[PDB]
Symmetry: C2
Subunit: 403 residues, 2 copies
Amino acid sequence: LMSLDTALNEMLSRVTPLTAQETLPLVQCFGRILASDVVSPLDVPGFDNSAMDGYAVRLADIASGQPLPVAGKSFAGQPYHGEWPAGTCIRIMAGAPVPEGCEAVVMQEQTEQMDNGVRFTAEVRSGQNIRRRGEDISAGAVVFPAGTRLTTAELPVIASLGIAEVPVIRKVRVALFSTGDELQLPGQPLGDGQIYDTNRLAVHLMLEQLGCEVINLGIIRDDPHALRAAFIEADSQADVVISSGGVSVGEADYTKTILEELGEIAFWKLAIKPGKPFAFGKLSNSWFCGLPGNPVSATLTFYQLVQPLLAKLSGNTASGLPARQRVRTASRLKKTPGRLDFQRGVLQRNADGELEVTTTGHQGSHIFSSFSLGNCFIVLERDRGNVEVGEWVEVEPFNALFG
Amino acid sequence: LMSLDTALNEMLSRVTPLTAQETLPLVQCFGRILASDVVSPLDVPGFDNRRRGEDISAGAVVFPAGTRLTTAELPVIASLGIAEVPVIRKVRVALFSTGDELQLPGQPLGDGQIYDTNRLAVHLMLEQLGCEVINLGIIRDDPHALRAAFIEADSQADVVISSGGVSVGEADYTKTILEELGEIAFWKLAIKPGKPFAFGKLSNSWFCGLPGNPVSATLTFYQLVQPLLAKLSGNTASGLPARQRVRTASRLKKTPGRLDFQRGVLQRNADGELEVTTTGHQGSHIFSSFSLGNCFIVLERDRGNVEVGEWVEVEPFNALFG
């Protein structure tokens, strides 16, 4: 019934980003959200210098058209403190400090050499091939805004400004559990209708690579007091509490009355496949997300719903839903209208060199092998139906969590 | 001179993957290379409905060794009851730089002194690639410091990296130290940004020497060092991080002779097709390219000046940059 776009936008609308912070040294900030605009304590370049390798020159001691010799030499790791008589043209590496009061630099190519000087093989216009102090970064400027996620792009650049640490938002904590006497841990033996608990691992794994703090509480026993106490424990320590399956996502039962008793939580029916059901709302101190028991469903549900929610909570100001490009079906695809279909395909380069998807196989939620063989999602539009080879189709790539 | 493709194949060819292993519970395996084919202890479906074993039949190999394990696979193994699997040990990479010109942060810039950045960047990439980093810091400008470092490093590492400082061709005391502890080539690569790269075998590890310039070093690492670590790690995932074809929404000055790795910004156009746009000045004197950008533009080597509308090769950035 409810639209995905609709459900998402309602979830994130109520959410207030964390602002609690902590200062860490640069080598620990990867994936961390900056909390306070990094401000340049210095100018970059710090000094005035030459973009190119050749000869610094003034237009006063050049006009004559006398090939001037060199008085001295500047280097990037070896500056210059000489004189420069009234007729010289100092040599200098690229990046190396321009002599006090130089008005232009000229690279070897625009000059001939001899036993008396450096005949400048072309004209020379002021400011040429001088990189200026602060031209790349001026002191007191903002280099990276708050809410920026730090990677190898930014952190080394902060290292270039002598800043050994920056404040970042604290990691989001996420409590996790599942429930069902039916659920067993590995190494234990499958009893009657008993099955091995898998959503919890998947979710747990996804949280950690999302840079969250996981509080994995295990399987909870099929007992109200056991569950009531799991929520309470989880709520006091988390920003977000996830049920990876077991707890009601709509169906009536003791777990459903426990949710109602501890929080105001919506139970939606979302117009998507795989999946459909989703529990969401506020507990006393955290947000609750409840996934359905089906592996393929809960993954998808989490990746598309819970994942967005965590981004906003985390203080990241990176707006957008993982890039999503248009491409052709090299396969046929049975789509049933009425539901936004997140099918998996395989994005690859074709004979020509253009990208094209291929289905992975049976798109049923009764096998997980899709996520492995696949390397993207094929977002067939809600009212769309069977797709024929050749058509233009919406395709979202897999992020790190898979590939 | 030397060809990237060439230099790449010549490095991977000499590398023998790690085979040493450890057994870890599923929750700690993310990113880790599986060391032994995961075999199904049971039938899936275990019961019957769509009957027992039609998806996964017992004795059947679910995942081959050399597979990197993510949310795709590890949940599937938890379905078979397996609480832990063997993976190859993390790749130990020892790291340092050298040059008195290098200062540490919080201290003041001396004369020609500058802040050591390559080491940070390299240390960062390594950890996210899931290596084990032995960061030995800044080495003093002394041949004995340097000698002592390579030894210390070689004895803990499968791979030793100098993020800068140690010669990559130019003749000086550190160059002679390399010839003394190892058989290391000094290449000059047909690429931009950059060019110089040192590579070889110490007594007990491979050495990779990046050049001083930040833009050069990051790129050289990403394009040479990174592949090298994947093979070493025992990953059997073959390929050059996906590289698709797309149009320049922008002009791009490209000189022939060198394979140019410029950065642009891949994005959805009005219609709905992917197109690229340059970041700005493609000089190596600034590092803002890796932030604004979100891919590389691999200008074919002999290619020169591109014009708007042309088909151009584009390799998106991985998680190392977003």
